[PDB]
Amino acid sequence: MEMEKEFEQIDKSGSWAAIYQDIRHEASDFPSRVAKLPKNKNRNRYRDVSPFDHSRIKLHQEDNDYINASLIKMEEAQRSYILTQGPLPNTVGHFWEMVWEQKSRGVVMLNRVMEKGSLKCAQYWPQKEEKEMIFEDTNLKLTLISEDIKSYYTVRQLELENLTTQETREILHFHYTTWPDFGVPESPASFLNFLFKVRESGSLSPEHGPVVVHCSAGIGRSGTFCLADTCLLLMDKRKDPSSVDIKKVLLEMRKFRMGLIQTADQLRFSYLAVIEGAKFIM
Numbered sequence: 144m145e146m147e148k149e150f151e152q153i154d155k156s157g158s159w160a161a162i163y164q165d166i167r168h169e170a171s172d173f174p175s176r177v178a179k180l181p182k183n184k185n186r187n188r189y190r191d192v193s194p195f196d197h198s199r200i201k202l203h204q205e206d207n208d209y210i211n212a213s214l215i216k217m218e219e220a221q222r223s224y225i226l227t228q229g230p231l232p233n234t235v236g237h238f239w240e241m242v243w244e245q246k247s248r249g250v251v252m253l254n255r256v257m258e259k260g261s262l263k264c265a266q267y268w269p270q271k272e273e274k275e276m277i278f279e280d281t282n283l284k285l286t287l288i289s290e291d292i293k294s295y296y297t298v299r300q301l302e303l304e305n306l307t308t309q310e311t312r313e314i315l316h317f318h319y320t321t322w323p324d325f326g327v328p329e330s331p332a333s334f335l336n337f338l339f340k341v342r343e344s345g346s347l348s349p350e351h352g353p354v355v356v357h358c359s360a361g362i363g364r365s366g367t368f369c370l371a372d373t374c375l376l377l378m379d380k381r382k383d384p385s386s387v388d389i390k391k392v393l394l395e396m397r398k399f400r401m402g403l404i405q406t407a408d409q410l411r412f413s414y415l416a417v418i419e420g421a422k423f424i425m
């Protein structure tokens with residue numbers, strides 16, 4: 144079926160939970176043996192969210208190459224994304240090592256450091272120009288260059304230096320700051336505006352390594368971001384935009400990381416975002 148009318152048909156029939164459970168039943172199951180080794184327990188935020196072995200990002204280290212991060216490679220859309228958990232106190236250096244090694248231009252953050260009174264990820268970037276951060280375990284230096292605070296998101300320019308080679312690179316930090324503590328946004332308008340700002344920066348384009356996107360577990364909000372982007376790109380590329388099947392795209396993405404889209408409300412919000420976004424594109 145088309146999307147917008149499939150949408151009203153699920154609303155009128157109140158069957159979002161049943162649609163979402165079908166997806167969970169059909170989703171791929173692949174091994175995640177490296178994630179479950181005992182030496183990696185303090186590298187995982189949640190025991191039930193792990194990268195598959197076949198698609199995990201490997202650190203360029205011989206001691207321990209493990210990080211909780213996955214490469215989502217979308218062949219028809221010609222887009223790649225790295226989805227990862229919010230960094231932990233003992234993985235902030237690994238996180239920036241990955242950004243460096245994979246040649247990423249942009250980092251997309253969809254959570255606040257504290258939500259619901261609890262910490263959802265480490266404070267992993269510097270907050271003042273004159274107070275830079277040094278990650279001694281991975282030999283990197285990170286400096287805040289500039290910051291632009293808007294009503295729904297903040298964009299930061301960062302300098303990452305590989306202290307071993309003295310090479311430097313500019314990284315863009317796109318921080319969506321207004322996702323509610325509970326539920327999903329009422330309108331997709333600000334989320335779509337944010338997605339377009341990431342696109343306009345070059346961070347999603349083939350002349351750079353894959354964008355790094357995270358929330359707390361790296362599957363819920365993060366899944367919504369890449370699902371909406373890929374679906375809109377396919378609607379631009381195909382002769383028949385109504386052929387794009389958001390449930391099929393989501394199942395394809397779940398071949399590369401488990402659990403993408405965490406609730407039926409996040410599924411409905413993803414539909415809403417693609418539907419509204421397809422009208423603005425034209």
Ligand SMILES: OCCCCn1cnc2cc(Cl)c(Cl)cc21
Nearest residue numbers: 332335336339419420421423424
């Ligand atoms: O090939 C399409 C180029 C222009 C698309 N575009 C630019 N600004 C946008 C803001 C929003 Cl909210 C949306 Cl949905 C789309 C946008």
